[PDB]
């Protein structure tokens, strides 16, 4: 889109490192400013000490609430505390040890102040907790793909998993109390002091997430094919797992670059113009794409390596095409899974997927948009798979049990690698052949402006409410504002025929909606489903 | 000196993590009697590092707050000019400066738009200010020059421009411990917003009025005249906009082989003992910069505060020593404004090439022990038409013989290379040739070793009587000095001569060792002769 899409970034387009991390100490933010306030939700809270919204006092009093909140529910073993490659993950991960440590938390660190991944996080505590001991937790400082500028931290209960809205609301309003109340009652002492207490011990946790990745994935078969493999790192936490990857199973994996650095520099810029480390962005991934001839596969993650892309000599897959793939495969080569073991799918990904699914004959469960709505499933092991369209999944180990409740990108990048030297056939030509069979859907999103007025008039809908019969030439068969799997609240509305579909939601950042649509009939079928999309949903929010 | 690694590109594994260390200046704190992490404020100020406790956010509201309260003592009502290079720990050190200084009533002027000052400009400043007889001004250098990217630096110039003689230095030194002490009781500070809403910082564009000043210095017209094709390495130094500017507004044909500023300085060549060391006198450092030597006519580096320069030639880079006679027998003789009484100061350790240059013009040598502050009163009331140092610092006058810098100014002697060129039509490099021919080809050497500190202090206070021995190589003893010739001041050491060369001993100031100069006239195997000796002697008169 921007003029400067796809472009090396420049000089000019950087921040300064030391200047904003200064920020976070020296401004704070404004009481009764409403936009400085902690906005703890499902991927935690996030914001920049530049627009003092990522500062101190917020690190300080979310670490607080999330000590109390951890108390409250019997939580007594270790808080696994991860950070990326973010410049504000390095000061929000020592005000996060100064609080735990001031609670009496024993806190559990990478050693040699390395980085994270949030699945390594995720998987640790699912790990740790196998054991039947106290119960560990979790804390992954992380704005995810965020720009340099930005900084995040999100909290991981016991099963491993995103914090759920029951969570992450009084963790929100706990922290603001506290922030308005000057910070009085958020228990701190120095680093010093906190690395005295006895309270923080620094371990490896790659060695143990790399070599349990063949209980996941096959990687003596991935071994055994000999394919050339890239990988663009990304500059992201998961830089050191993918060079002990390649050391410890042999690969022949080339890391396209091994910069770390916290003005992201080497980074092409997005479609927007930021900086911003989006595996599933054609922009942001066209240093890996021009060398795409060079690999049979390649692939890269964002920084806290939740999200996954996968590059062949074709380009960049898109995202909804290899959920497709990813779970017409393993479904049919994960031998130890029971036959109730289920696919978890977000209702704005890909028909695609129900079509695999019900060729397989598996059971298909339509949740809300959101990562959270699959955790409880792969937990307990009645999900195998979940995924979103935005590039994030997970799925079993070989026996059928949790590796990692959270999002893990290096899964899903190494499962590419799988099918690959399994099958002989990259996850592209597999995509190719279920267009084949199913016909080629054309997937697209829309956005526009809304007011706080139809934005919470679109979030309470009743079915009923579209006056429409058709559309795009066919009958309406579904009219939802729940979700068919879990009969939650999508907040909004899908609408499909045989040929078709669309959902309408709110965002969540902006004053907008987002509309979702796909047509099994082709590009030109889709722009009339768009049409009518956006028809229907300005007469359903008209009053 | 030299490692395995000299020369080398750095690599990621050499790299510091900029926003770990900016969170421990403000996180981590000086321990309570340990020498280490007092406040050290000398001849260049205090340096040190977050990380090593030595420069943390104690010491520089410590040292802020003892400059604040020593100017007033001095009477000095006017703005302090605060300039910031680009290592990471300015950044934080400029703010707790600026709200220092603002909650004690100081008027403040910085670089608008956060930006980065040479400490010439700072000096110019300063003078410029001053010359216009209202309240008087000084400043604040925030750099630690060549040292590490870990490292951080902060000094003092008062109103004569210059660098901090001993007694304003230990005056500082002494109450910034106290207050340190104290538990920095009697600091007052205020926060960032406050002082930036106090009316108390101005921002201003600082580069156009040194730039456009240039013109009264160096002869511009005749360099733009020359058409030379110029190359410049910035080394991701507080310079680099000055160097866009200078090319700009006097059109040359100036290029920049890199415009990377990056608080890592990761594009650096490793010095000769294998760290990243900005040092534009080492060839190691500058290996990048010497790859295209003959892309240009002249080519200029210059370290990251901008008072020290680096001159090459598709010759490769001049030696010091050598460029410091070209200049001054180039200025004296084309500097027709300036009085028969205007006079050459040179550092005793500098080489005798200078000695016999000004011997030759018929003007006045002033000796002075190390160290530029000794040229300060002498620049400031243009009795010094020029002060330089062996270790590639140097200035001089304005073409009427008022100050332009009273520090060392890396910007005005790489123009002086150009101006040489296009004048004169032979290079500094050349030139040097033709003095060799006149006076000899000096061979010149550093030595160091360890000694005790007992044999350390005892170097400080010898006399000359105490040196028995009458002859140095083969040659008789003609001077055995304690004190500087030119100003009295004692060069705690020894210095020893005859006609055909000299060395001198004193203590280092940062480690166990001594150094020892050494020169001869009669070349290297006699220079060699000349370092056997001086370690003889050396040896014999410290017990
Ligand atoms: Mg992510
Ligand atoms: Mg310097």
């Not at 050693?111 to 001991?133: D, Q, R, Y």
């Not at 129900?354 to 937990?379: A, I, Q, S």
């Amino acid at each position: 889109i921007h003029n400067r899409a796809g472009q090396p970034a420049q000089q000019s387009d950087l921040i300064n490192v030391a200047q904003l991390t200064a920020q976070y100490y020296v401004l704070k933010p404004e009481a009764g400013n409403a936009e400085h306030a902690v906005k703890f939700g499902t991927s935690g809270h996030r914001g920049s000490a530049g627009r003092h919204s990522f500062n101190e006092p917020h690190i300080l009093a979310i670490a607080q609430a999330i000590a109390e909140e951890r108390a409250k529910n019997g939580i007594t073993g270790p808080c696994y505390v991860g950070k990326d490659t973010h410049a504000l993950s390095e000061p929000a991960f020592i005000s996060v040890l100064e609080v735990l440590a001031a609670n009496g938390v024993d806190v559990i660190v990478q050693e040699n102040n390395g980085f994270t991944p949030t699945p390594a996080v995720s998987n640790a505590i699912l790990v740790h907790n196998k054991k039947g001991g106290p119960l560990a937790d979790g804390i992954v400082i992380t704005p995810s793909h965020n720009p340099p500028e930005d900084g995040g931290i999100k909290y991981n209960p016991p099963n491993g998993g995103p914090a759920d809205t029951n969570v992450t609301k009084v963790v929100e309003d706990r922290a603001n109390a506290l922030l308005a109340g000057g910070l009085q009652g958020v228990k701190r002492i120095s680093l010093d002091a906190a690395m005295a207490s006895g309270h923080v011990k620094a371990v490896d946790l790659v060695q143990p997430f790399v070599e349990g990745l063949a209980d996941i994935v096959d990687m003596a078969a991935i071994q055994k094919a000999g394919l050339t493999l890239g990988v663009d790192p990304l500059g992201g936490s998961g830089i050191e797992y993918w060079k002990r990857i390649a050391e410890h199973y042999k690969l022949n994996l080339t890391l396209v670059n091994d910069q770390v650095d916290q003005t992201f520099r080497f980074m092409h810029l997005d479609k927007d113009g930021a900086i911003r480390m989006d595996c599933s962005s054609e922009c942001a991934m066209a240093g890996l794409l021009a060398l795409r001839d060079k690999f049979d596969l390649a692939f890269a993650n964002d920084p806290d390596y939740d999200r996954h892309g996968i590059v062949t000599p074709a380009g960049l897959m898109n995202p909804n095409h290899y959920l497709a793939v990813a779970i017409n495969y393993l479904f049919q080569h994960r031998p130890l899974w029971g036959k109730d073991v289920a696919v978890g799918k977000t209702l704005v990904s890909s028909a695609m997927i129900d079509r695999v699914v019900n060729d397989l004959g598996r059971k298909l469960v339509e949740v809300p948009v959101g990562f959270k709505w699959f955790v409880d499933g792969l937990f307990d092991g009645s999900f195998g798979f979940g995924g979103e369209e935005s590039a994030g999944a997970s799925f079993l180990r070989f026996d059928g049990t949790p590796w990692s409740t959270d999002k893990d990108g290096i899964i899903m990048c190494l499962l590419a690698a799988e099918i690959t030297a399994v099958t002989g056939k990259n996850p592209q030509e597999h995509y190719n052949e279920l267009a084949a069979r199913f016909g080629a859907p054309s997937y697209n999103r829309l956005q526009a402006s809304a007011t706080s007025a139809q934005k919470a008039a679109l979030s309470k809908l009743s079915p009923e409410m579209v006056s429409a019969s058709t559309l795009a030439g066919d009958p309406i068969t579904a009219r939802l504002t729940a979700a068919p799997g879990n009969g939650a609240s999508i907040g909004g509305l899908k609408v499909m025929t045989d040929n078709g579909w669309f959902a309408a939601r709110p965002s969540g950042t902006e004053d907008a909606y987002k509309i979702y649509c796909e047509s099994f009939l082709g590009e030109e079928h889709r722009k009339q489903i768009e049409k009518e999309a956006v028809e229907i949903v300005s007469e359903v929010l008209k009053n």
